[PDB]
Amino acid sequence: GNNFEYTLEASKSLRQKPGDSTMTYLNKGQFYPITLKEVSSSKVRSVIMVVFAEDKSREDQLRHWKYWHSRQHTAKQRCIDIADYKESFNTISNVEEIAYNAISFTWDINDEAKVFISVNCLSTDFSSQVKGLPLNIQIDTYSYNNRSNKPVHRAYCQIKVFCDKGAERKIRDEERKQMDITVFKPFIDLDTQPVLFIPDVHFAN
Secondary structure, eight states, X not given: OOOEEEEEOSEEOOOOSTTOOXXXXXXXTOOEEEEEEEOOOOEEEEXXXXXXXXXXXXXXXXXXXXXXXXXXXSTTOOSEXXXXXXXXXXXXXXXXXXXXXXXXXXXXXXXXXEEEEXXXXXXXXXXXXXXXXXXXXXXXXXXXXXXSSSOSEEEEEEEEEESTTHXXXXXXXXXXXXXXXEXXXXXXXXXXXXXXXXXXXXXXX
């Protein structure tokens, strides 16, 4: 009995042509409302993360993260952040920053978990010239028993990140030439573990 659903409340682009893929637009470093719900008719752990969508080798993805982190203006700056709203903490607990691109927390499936998440990197922050690297917000949900050590449910959401207020601009700008909630898309490959970026400065010299 584990039908989960996740939502991201931001602006998503319109599909022009059949086969085109939809994108949700975010501003860099701005908190967005995400909900998590179990809608079957006791407690679980979910990991919200930012990952590369193009399914690249682990070495590549780390290279990129290092490249990114290499250029942040504080070493303390993460890829994904969560806000301290009491609204959110009435519904989640055991918040843990297991990596610079992942946040873990537990919640009760009899409740709706509410969190507020910012993504802090641009799609073009991984090379200093081209187009951008496709990014997803991915959510893996674990039974608390975690017997299998695998997630029991996974979903994702394709995103593009902008600086300043560029998310709202890009929307209005595709509107001149020519919905409030993005629902995460489930997938069933429970084995592929995602690359966690844990910056380390041992032996810098």
